[PDB]
Design a protein around this nucleic acid. Structure first.
Ligand SMILES: Nc1ncnc2c1ncn2[C@@H]1O[C@H](COP(=O)(O)OP(=O)(O)O)[C@@H](O)[C@H]1O
Ligand SMILES: Nc1ncnc2c1ncn2[C@@H]1O[C@H](COP(=O)(O)OP(=O)(O)O)[C@@H](O)[C@H]1O
Ligand SMILES: [Mg+2]
Ligand SMILES: [Mg+2]
Ligand SMILES: [Zn+2]
Ligand SMILES: [Zn+2]
Ligand SMILES: [Zn+2]
Lengths: 635, 637, 460, 49
DNA sequence: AAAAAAAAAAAAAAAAAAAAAAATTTTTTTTTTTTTTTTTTTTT
């Protein structure tokens, strides 16, 4: 006689009151105003703030946090009442409730079994994301021994058939045909995340667990992000996970076996309905946010800007000496190496990719190489770029086999499709890849990144799946000279051992010679020792890391023109550069250096967020290249 | 009993019927009442006669030992009582035989007894569940391969090295069933490893209407710990041997890979299904251990990071003894001589190894932008195959916690970093870590470092430079931690330091790698006659044959308490030291200085400060750093 | 190594009472029912009964429901409410106690047979009209008159079946007792690896290896006095089993105790199942005596006391009493080595006026003789005066209808109205009264039936 | 599927009683070729059928 | 002559083809036993 879950229904009542009576500081019912928007299609969840829950009613908040799994469909039906009473939605549509701003936090090591079935939030790095699918939630079946339809059987993260046919005189437990049209599904994406690098124990592999994303919180996560998740920890049934027998269910009916049909062996197990109970933790993400959000939300991003950050980046753009200021903020630790500071900053801003009418994809990224004597802050610059920017992947030399370097393949464990696992270039897409010990990359993969640099794209066809993955990343390379030490009496192409096309593709080359000059030596010693003595202070990044990072994200979408005067200056200055080439530089000048100079001029216009590249930018870009290219010093 | 429920005990296993036979439990002579009263008697009467105040910390020795433990339990609120099987053996033998031979029932009798005593005392405290005894320090099973099947389901203690720990495995405990007709609910506790499903509703009486609801049933934890036995009695020509451990509930994740542990647990033999799906099982039984107690304490090794982090580890008298040792004048040399007594008069080398054991100051850098900064010391020992560099590496590998050892090209980059393997126990492509990752927060002792081919030597640059490590392959795309300290032992070209060759060519290693290192000791042969005679007498005495404890305590206290910060005098001394080092480095025949060598001087100054328990790095520290970094590399000569 | 399959083994049990404990309490009832008073000296009635019967080769006992209730009230209630399985427990208890009492039996009877525990009550019966549906599968007690008793056919209690391909056997299945069928299994369970399986319906009933027991399908009828005025008599089948076969015969007036039941032959007047009573108990409506009769021989006036006591109510005719006592004792038969038969019966005739107590005296003699039949000269109502052989149409068996002269063999026939009897009867008795053998030679067969009666004839 | 005698005995033949007689089968040669499209016949961008 | 790079070999893991493995009572027919009816042959 339809026994009622008293606490869950009281939670439905109190939460319906919360929805229809909690009002913002302005005084209006904020969640009424939010429920207004679920009338639209492609929208079936409200996003209720857990802090609002706490403020309105602490008792209900603790009850939900301690009984989240049992109350969840009840809260969903409370929302269904709250929206159907006002607006005239389709009756069949389902709804969901998404929590965020939860006070407590936990770790993937803390997600122990006691946290099963109750709300919890974690942080993670989204490894990979399987495709969207429709998942069956409530099935309608037909019993193939009396053709009676069994209605609305729940799926507990497994294809569940009705436990017995609803007709009393028919004990069908086997032959059921799913009536697909009558059943209702939920949109569903499975994603894999792993422990953040901060939370690793000693000698520990990063654990990884699978997180299920039900409707409307489905494509929000993406591979490579740093996302906080909030939701239940559930258990999804597993089978044949172990070769040792474990916990097994079976009916408690005391039946025996008659002679010739004795309930032994396979017949016996099928008769009793024996089944192993092997489970696995599978987080059930109710909501997903970036763990380090960029904003509290060019014209669209500008609208997303809050007023304070908007005026901040505005006065940033209006600032003069922003050039050296950005240098200092990016590299407070570094002393000297101003050319590397400038080149790497321009690399972060990037150029403007373009494409011809015929279809030739003109490069827009600008790859930089640092080559020098040992212990000259090369790996340090790459680490600075890594730790600074998002979409800043890092790898070093022979630590990355090609498959993980660019792309790999796996089959969808659920469906027939294949998931194209994202390699370093992909995770660095539309960003930076910092490659260290670039000279010590095998030919088999240095050619791969060369293909990426030529085409901004790699097409993988392997193990039964073909695809054309885009990778518009920019490469910052570190290259040790041959012999360990650079030799200024030799050309660059014989100091290092890169392939000639790779060296051609590389946009900027910086030479860092470890000469022994004692004023500089005093400077460096004072600098680093000052840092170690005064770790926390002794940094004067005039703009905070978040400030300049937001400035980069906002500046990126401005695409400079090239005015006619600047074009005249460009051509005449490249002519002067060729006159220099015509003594000799350690790496000769070609039309690729013209391409490099125009791309750097574009990137300086990008730094100042202009819509026109001016002779100021052109002059500075030429100066950068001219000082980068050095005269080989024969005695 | 104060309305405090007795908790499930997955470690003991599926409960048996508990049948009683009149002559005890069937086939096992325990006499549950006799066991309970004997255990109460032990728990009050036992005063450890020969014990030490160093061992028992914060415990009034003459007062009842385990009752003071119960008092610690009451004040703290952790319902675990770590009982010692050697204490039990000393007090009475038959009780110990009961515990060793029939743990599966003897444990809940002990828990009943301890709860009886606990609420005989303290009838007002609050506990999250009843008290759980945990025996340990059984008779050490020397070689687990010698475990006959006559020792099945007994209690054993083994010592090993944790190589792997699985993800959390749930374990059903209260199958929560719900009718699909009337929604009536019920709960079935795990009967004997099985869930007797109700098969008929108790309110509408429909048959087979009750469906198991998974994530409304309460669960427990379970983690598969893959350990390799490190016995103290290895027979002839027997390879080493992994073993499987299962740790339940609060014991999960309390041991990380690379941790050498003494695990005390009940032995188990289990069938194995022939296929994954069929129910036939091979007559041969695989075995494993269910784990009651982790013990990360050993006399021959330094205090692990957990014991560093814990506070109540040293008595007041012991910390004061450490303070006056710091006040001793020549403590640096005292500890240096204390290290490795069986090696003769390598005072500079042992001072360097001591500085390595101390480490430096792990400095936070997160908002600086600099990235992680290596706070550890890397040492190279260069010499022909007559010196005792291999002996030093062997000794340090034995003495350290989280030690790993490698020799020559008996390795590879893949097997040093990580690989993907089908675990035989779960049939899953799990990830496994190599030596560099295993010795994460300890020491990696590399031997025959010259014969290390380019692929498997190029990975050491990552470790020595960043303290991180990258494995970007088809297996996983991640970034592990490897904060190890490298203790390398290299040989010159043609296995002899001939005089007519400068140092860098005689060593013949990459110059960038020698820059990575932080001390480089060249064990040339001193031809001195008196040294020759003293060495000879020392070795013959080594045949005709400070304390490790005080050494451990001092080092662990220095790690726990004092993190040195630079003093302005030391900063000026360092700047002067580095410019002087570069000035002598004009002649590049020797190993030229670098800003990396400045950082090495920083770290060695911090290590000397920690030797003094300075808390402030000073000119004395910096000068010793310079002198050591010069005598090492022999830049005078 | 995989060439064998040794059997399972198990052990004795070390450690609403369960059916095993009810088995134990039935065992206690039999083993400890003490009937003899301490004044009278004690005896274990059922232990002695099991011992004696099992030694004789009887394999049954008679347990009174009153004794069961006295020793254990709950057992009596259990058998009244759910007789079947509790009767099974009781039979198992009888088997075990039998084994205990005659444990060191000599060789030649090593196997222990089952025991049939018949039960008899003293509670007054219900009525066949009162056997409504609610009293079904409970033990009921009923009176009646049997009218038709079929032949004892062999029904199987335990069987064995062989597989036609693999030739392995399912020895000693148990057949559920009653008129309960048994569907054969449809799968050979004996699985041999790497070989095709035995066919779909592999099993054939090995007839050599079964355990079979008799059974008789009787017809009971409502007692004619018990029938109401306007009503046809009710009937009920009965299924007599293993020692209730031949314990009764048609015409006998009996009281039964049994399980009102249904015929269970598959799931093949909707919902009706033809019903019967699996009968458990039947009743049919010394040295001291020998010493009394030896004294009666020793008396002086034995002749006189018998003569007076055979006609205490019949005035006069003391000589008539004398001769009728001589009759009731009869003479003695002799069979000389010639091979002939000399009649021993004494034949008396009373040719009397219609006033005297001829018919009353005959009624006395038929009551007072052991085997007495009072018939007219023209037989009695639907009962001939002399035997008649008939050849059946269908089975062509010899159905002998028995008259007075053959029904009352070794006794007295009181032939009232000897002066009127059919000529065929007269010709029969002509030699049935001096040869005592009635010869009938029909187209089927010759027979010489034995009519060894004595004729007390009365006529006007 | 079923033996067709009507004379197997008083009982009948089982279900699926027939086993192929291998020796009494008269057989032939066969070969599964993998024919691929003519290389000059294949159009430009496609793959060989 | 020894180091670095490339090619081949060995061994583990995965995807599809095709031969094996498993499940599997109920309804209709019809012979035989029994009774019943009309007739002829025989007896009173
Ligand atoms: N100009 C400089 N400014 C600041 N630090 C420097 C400078 N030159 C060298 N260093 C120091 O040298 C260390 C190592 O430099 P790194 O670039 O890792 O060497 P490599 O280029 O061989 O990897 C850095 O941690 C940094 O502190
Ligand atoms: N001599 C007698 N003594 C006692 N009762 C007699 C006698 N003669 C006749 N009767 C009575 O007369 C009735 C008829 O008796 P019955 O023997 O049938 O006479 P009969 O033998 O002449 O037919 C009986 O009830 C009986 O009591
Ligand atoms: Mg580097
Ligand atoms: Mg008369
Ligand atoms: Zn059905
Ligand atoms: Zn129900
Ligand atoms: Zn068979």
């Amino acid at each position: 006689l339809e026994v009622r879950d008293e606490v869950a229904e009281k939670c439905q009542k109190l939460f319906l009151d919360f929805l229809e009576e909690f009002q913002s500081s302005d005084g209006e019912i904020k969640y009424l105003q939010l429920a207004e928007e679920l009338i639209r299609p492609e929208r079936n969840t409200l996003v209720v703030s857990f802090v609002d829950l706490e403020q309105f009613n602490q008792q209900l908040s603790t009850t939900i946090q301690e009984e989240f799994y049992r109350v969840y469909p009840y809260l969903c039906r409370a929302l269904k009442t709250f929206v159907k009473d006002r607006k005239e939605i389709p009756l069949a549509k389902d709804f969901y409730v998404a929590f965020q701003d939860l006070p407590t936090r936990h770790k993937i090591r803390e997600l122990t079994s006691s946290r099963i079935g109750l709300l919890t939030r974690i942080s993670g790095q989204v490894v990979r994301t399987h495709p969207v699918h429709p998942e069956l939630v409530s099935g309608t079946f037909l019993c193939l021994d009396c053709q009676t339809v069994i209605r609305d059987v729940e799926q507990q993260f497994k294809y569940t058939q009705p436990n017995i046919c609803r007709n009393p005189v028919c004990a069908n437990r086997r032959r059921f045909l799913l009536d697909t049209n009558k059943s209702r599904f939920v949109d569903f994406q499975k994603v894999r995340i792993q422990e953040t690098q901060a939370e690793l124990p000693r000698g520990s592999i990063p654990r990884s667990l699978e997180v299920i994303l039900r409707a409307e919180a489905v494509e929000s996560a993406q591979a490579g992000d740093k996302c906080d998740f909030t939701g239940t920890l559930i258990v999804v049934p597993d089978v044949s996970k172990l070769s040792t027998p474990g916990a097994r269910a079976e009916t408690n009916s005391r039946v025996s076996g008659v002679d010739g049909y004795e309930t032994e062996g396979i017949r016996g197990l099928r008769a009793l309905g024996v089944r192993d109970l092997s489970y696995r933790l599978v987080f059930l993400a109710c909501c997903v946010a970036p763990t380090n959000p960029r904003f509290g939300g060019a014209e669209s991003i500008k609208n997303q800007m809050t007023v304070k950050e908007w005026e901040k980046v505005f006065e940033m753009s209006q600032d003069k000496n922003l050039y050296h200021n950005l240098c200092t903020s990016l590299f407070p630790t570094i002393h000297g190496n101003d050319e590397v500071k400038r080149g790497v900053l321009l690399m972060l801003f990037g150029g403007v990719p373009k494409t011809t009418g015929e279809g030739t994809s003109l490069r827009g990224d600008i790859n930089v190489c640092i080559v020098g004597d040992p212990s000259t802050a090369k790996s340090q610059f790459l680490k600075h770029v890594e730790e600074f920017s998002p979409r800043a992947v890092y790898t070093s030399g022979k630590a990355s086999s090609a498959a993980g370097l660019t792309a790999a393949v796996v089959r969808d464990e659920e469906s027939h499709e294949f998931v194209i696992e994202a390699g370093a270039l992909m995770l660095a897409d539309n960003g930076v890849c910092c490659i260290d010990e670039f000279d010590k990359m095998d030919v088999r993969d240095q050619v791969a990144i060369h293909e990426a640099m030529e085409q901004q794209t790699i097409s993988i066809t392997k193990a039964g799946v073909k695809a054309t993955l885009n990778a518009r990343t920019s490469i910052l390379a570190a290259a040790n000279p041959i012999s360990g030490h650079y030799d200024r009496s030799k050309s660059l192409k014989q100091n290092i051992n890169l392939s000639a096309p790779i060296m051609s593709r590389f946009d900027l080359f910086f030479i860092l010679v470890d000469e022994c000059n004692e004023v500089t030596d005093y400077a460096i010693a004072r600098r680093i020792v000052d840092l170690h003595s005064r770790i926390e202070e002794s940094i004067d990044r005039v703009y905070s890391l978040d400030d300049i990072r937001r400035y980069l994200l906002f500046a990126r979408q401005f695409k400079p023109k090239i005015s006619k005067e600047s074009e005249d200056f460009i051509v005449e200055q490249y002519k002067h550069l060729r006159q220099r080439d015509g003594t000799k530089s350690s790496w000769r000048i070609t039309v690729r250096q013209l391409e490099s100079m125009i791309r750097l001029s574009e990137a300086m216009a990008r730094m100042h967020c202009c819509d026109e590249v001016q002779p100021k930018h052109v002059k500075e870009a030429f100066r950068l290249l001219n000082k980068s290219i050095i005269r080989v010093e024969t005695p | 009993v104060r309305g405090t429920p007795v908790r499930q005990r997955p470690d003991l296993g599926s409960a048996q019927k508990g049948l009683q036979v009149d002559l005890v439990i069937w086939g096992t002579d325990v006499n549950v009442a006799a066991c309970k009263e004997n255990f109460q008697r032990f728990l009050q009467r036992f005063i450890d006669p020969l014990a030490k105040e160093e061992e028992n910390v914060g415990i009034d020795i003459t007062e009842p030992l385990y009752m003071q433990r119960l008092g610690e339990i009451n004040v703290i609120g952790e319902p675990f009582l770590n009982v010692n099987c050697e204490h039990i053996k000393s007090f009475d033998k038959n009780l110990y035989r009961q515990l060793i031979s029939y743990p599966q029932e003897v444990i809940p009798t002990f828990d009943m007894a301890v709860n009886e005593i606990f609420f005989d005392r303290y009838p007002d405290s609050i506990l999250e569940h009843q008290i759980q005894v945990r025996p340990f320090n059984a008779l050490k099973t020397k070689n687990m391969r010698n475990l006959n099947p006559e020792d099945i389901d007994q209690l054993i203690t083994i010592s090993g090295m944790v190589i792997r720990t699985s993800q959390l495995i749930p374990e059903m405990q209260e199958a929560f069933f719900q009718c699909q007709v009337c929604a009536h609910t019920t709960r079935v506790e795990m009967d004997r490893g099985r869930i007797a499903e109700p098969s008929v509703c108790g309110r509408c009486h429909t048959t087979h209407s009750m469906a198991l609801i998974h994530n409304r049933s309460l669960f427990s934890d379970k983690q598969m710990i893959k350990l390799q036995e490190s016995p103290e009695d290895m027979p002839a020509g027997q390879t080493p041997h992994t073993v499987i451990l299962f740790a339940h509930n609060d014991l999960v994740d309390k041991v990380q890979p690379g941790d050498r542990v003494n695990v005390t647990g009940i032995y188990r033999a289990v069938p194995i299904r022939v296929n994954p799906r069929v129910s036939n099982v091979k007559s041969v039984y695989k075995t494993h251990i269910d784990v009651i107690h982790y013990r990360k304490t050993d006399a021959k090794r330094l205090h692990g990071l957990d014991e560093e982090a814990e506070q109540k580890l040293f008595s007041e008298k012991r910390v004061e003894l450490l303070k006056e040792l710091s006040r001793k004048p020549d403590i640096y040399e005292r500890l240096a001589s204390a290290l490795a007594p069986s090696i003769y008069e390598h005072e500079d080398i042992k001072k360097g190894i001591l500085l390595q054991l101390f480490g430096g100051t792990r400095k936070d850098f997160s908002h600086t932008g600099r990235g992680k900064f290596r706070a550890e010391i890397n040492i190279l020992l260069c010499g022909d195959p007559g010196t005792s560099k291999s002996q030093l590496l062997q000794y340090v590998y034995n003495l350290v916690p989280r030690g790993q050892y490698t020799s020559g090209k008996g390795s590879s980059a893949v097997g040093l970093t990580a690989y993907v393997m089908k675990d035989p126990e779960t049939r899953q492509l799990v990830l496994q870590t190599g030596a560099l990752v295993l010795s994460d927060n300890g020491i990696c002792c590399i031997d025959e470092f010259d014969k290390m081919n380019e692929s498997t030597r190029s990975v050491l640059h990552e470790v020595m430079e960043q303290q991180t490590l990258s494995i970007a392959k088809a297996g996983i795309i991640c970034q592990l931690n490897a904060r190890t300290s490298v203790l390398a032992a290299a040989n010159p070209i043609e296995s002899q330091w001939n005089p007519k060759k400068t140092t860098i060519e005689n060593i013949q290693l990459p110059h960038t790698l020698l820059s990575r290192f932080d001390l480089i000791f060249l064990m040339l042969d001193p031809q001195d006659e008196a040294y020759d005679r003293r060495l000879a007498h020392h070795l013959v005495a080594l045949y005709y044959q400070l304390d490790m404890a005080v050494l451990k305590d001092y080092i662990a206290y220095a790690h726990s308490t004092i993190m040195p910060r630079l003093s302005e005098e030391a900063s000026q001394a360092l700047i002067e030291a580095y410019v002087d080092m570069r000035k002598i480095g004009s002649s590049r025949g020797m190993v030229s200085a670098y800003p990396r060598q400045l950082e090495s001087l920083i770290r060695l100054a911090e290590a000397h400060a920690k030797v003094r328990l300075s808390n402030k790095v000073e000119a004395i520290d910096v000068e010793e750093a310079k002198r050591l970094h010069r005598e090492a590399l022999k830049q005078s000569a | 190594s995989g060439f064998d399959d040794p059997g399972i083994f198990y052990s004795d049990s070390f450690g609403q009472a369960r059916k095993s404990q009810l088995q134990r309490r039935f065992k206690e009832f039999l083993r400890q029912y003490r009937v003899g008073t301490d004044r009278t000296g004690f005896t274990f009635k059922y232990r002695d009964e099991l011992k004696r019967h099992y030694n004789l080769g009887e394999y049954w006992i008679e347990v009174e429901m009153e004794d069961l209730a006295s020793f254990d009230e709950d057992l009596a209630d259990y058998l009244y409410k759910q007789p079947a399985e509790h009767l099974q427990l009781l039979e198992e208890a009888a088997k075990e106690v039998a084994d205990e009492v005659t444990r060191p039996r000599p060789s030649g009877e090593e196997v222990l047979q089952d025991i049939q525990v018949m039960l008899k009550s003293d509670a007054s019966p219900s009525s066949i009209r009162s056997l409504k549906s609610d009293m079904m599968s409970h033990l009921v007690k009923i009176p009646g008159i049997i009218i038709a008793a079929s032949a004892v056919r062999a029904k199987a209690t335990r069987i064995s079946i062989q597989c036609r391909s693999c030739r392995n056997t399912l020895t000693n299945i148990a057949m559920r007792p009653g008129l309960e069928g048994y569907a054969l299994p449809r799968k050979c369970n004996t699985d041999q690896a790497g070989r095709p399986k035995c066919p779909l319906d592999p099993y054939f009933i090995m007839p050599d290896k079964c355990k079979c027991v008799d059974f008789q399908t009787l017809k009971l009828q409502e007692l004619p006095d018990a029938v109401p005025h306007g009503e046809m008599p009710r009937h009920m089948q009965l299924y007599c089993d293993r020692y209730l076969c031949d314990k009764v015969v048609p015409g006998n007036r009996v009281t039964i105790m049994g399980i009102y039941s249904i015929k269970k032959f598959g799931l093949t007047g909707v919902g009706i199942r033809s019903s019967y009573i699996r009968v458990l108990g039947i009743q049919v409506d010394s040295p001291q005596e020998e010493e009394e009769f030896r004294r009666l021989a020793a008396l002086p006036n034995v002749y006189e006391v018998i003569s007076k006591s055979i006609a205490p109510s019949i005035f006069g005719g003391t000589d008539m009493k004398k001769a009728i006592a001589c009759l009731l004792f009869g003479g003695s038969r002799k069979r000389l080595p010639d091979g002939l038969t000399r009649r021993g019966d004494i034949n008396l005739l009373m040719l009397g006026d219609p006033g005297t107590a001829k018919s009353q005296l005959l009624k006395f003699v038929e009551k007072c003789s052991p085997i007495g039949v009072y018939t007219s000269g023209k037989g009695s109502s639907a009962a001939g005066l002399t035997a008649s052989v008939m050849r059946d149409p269908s089975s062509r068996n010899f159905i002998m209808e028995g008259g007075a002269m053959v029904l009352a063999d070794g006794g007295v026939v009181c032939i009232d109205e000897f002066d009127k009897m059919r000529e065929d009867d007269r010709v029969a008795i002509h030699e049935a009264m001096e040869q005592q053998t009635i010869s009938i030679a029909k187209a089927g067969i010759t027979t010489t039936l034995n009519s060894r009666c004595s004729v007390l004839a009365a006529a006007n």
